[PDB]
Structure 1
């Protein structure tokens, strides 16, 4: 469960992300596709080459859903019920992959926010991505 310190930590870090959220979403996806090629099986309809417009646009959507989760940190299941339905009944992405994207998001954050990515903040962000993942896979069966 997210403690008060975690929520504060997550709000602060994401606040600094600010207008780069979309750029960081896209970079996290690109790192995921390269590092964990099995994840490409879910995007056979995308052009997955460097700088493709599909990856960029998708990076923005992912980043925006996270902004929304951070803003609704105390009420995630409700704020993300629609995305949760989407993943469980249409996309049907195997749960193992959420860990892979989460890790790539952390690496992206670490790479772009050196001063803000302290040990305690690293801990909170990992817990937060794990809760988001839990929520997005809660209706799978």
Structure 2
């Protein structure tokens, strides 16, 4: 679980890097589809799932808007992310083993873009937070 120290560290990191939310999402999703090709099938209804796609860029803005929502709802991620859990479990049927894949891609992207801010201390609290995000997104699965 997230301590007061973890919550403050996640809020302070997002306060610094959130300006680049859209770019972080485009790059994280781009990486996920290329590096973990099992995930591409979930986006295959889009007209373009190739590198540089405007669909991947548009969806990356939404994904990091879900992360920004999770930072706002950090005191109660289950209730805050319930609708997104229902969407991924029931409407999309995304296998829940994939949440940790996108979380790793998000950490890699933040590391590439914000090497000074993404210290080991920022990383431990953000990783605990993304584990909590994955568990909240897993709420409606079983």
TM-score, length basis structure 1: 0.95
User: Where in structure 2 are the equivalents of 1:1-141 lying within 5 Å?
Assistant: 1-46=1-46, 47-141=48-142
**Structure 1 ranges of 4+ moved more than 6 A:** none
CA distance in 2, matches of 1:115, 1:53: 29
Size of the aligned set, in residue pairs, is: 141
CA drift of 1:19 comes to 2.3
Deviations 1:9-62 (A, max 9, x none): 111111111221011001000111111111101111121122211101100001
Gap regions ≥5 residues in structure 1: none
Gap regions ≥5 residues in structure 2: none
CA drift of 1:2 comes to 0.5
SS at match of 2:45: coil
Deviations 1:85-106 (A, max 9, x none): 1112111111111111000000
Deviations 1:108-134 (A, max 9, x none): 011111111111111111111111011
